[PDB]
User: Fold Receptor-interacting serine/threonine-protein kinase 3 from Homo sapiens.
Amino acid sequence: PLVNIYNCSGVQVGDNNYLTMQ
Amino acid sequence: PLVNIYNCSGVQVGDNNYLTMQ
Amino acid sequence: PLVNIYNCSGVQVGDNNYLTMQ
Assistant:
């Protein structure tokens, strides 16, 4: 459930369709 | 359910259609 | 259901059509 990510770029949490970025 | 992300860029939470960014 | 994101940039919650940004 909870994540507590506080990242700084592209990020899923999870299902189909693998994200893209550059 | 809950996430508590407080990230600072592109982010899904999850389904089809993988996001894009740059 | 609930998310509690308080992020600071592009973000879906999830369905088709992968968002874009820059």
Remarks:
- The radius of gyration of chain C is 10 Å.
- Chain C is about 0% helix and 0% strand.
- Chain C touches chain B through 22 residues (CB under 8 Å).
- The CA atoms of residues 6 and 12 of chain C lie 13 Å apart.
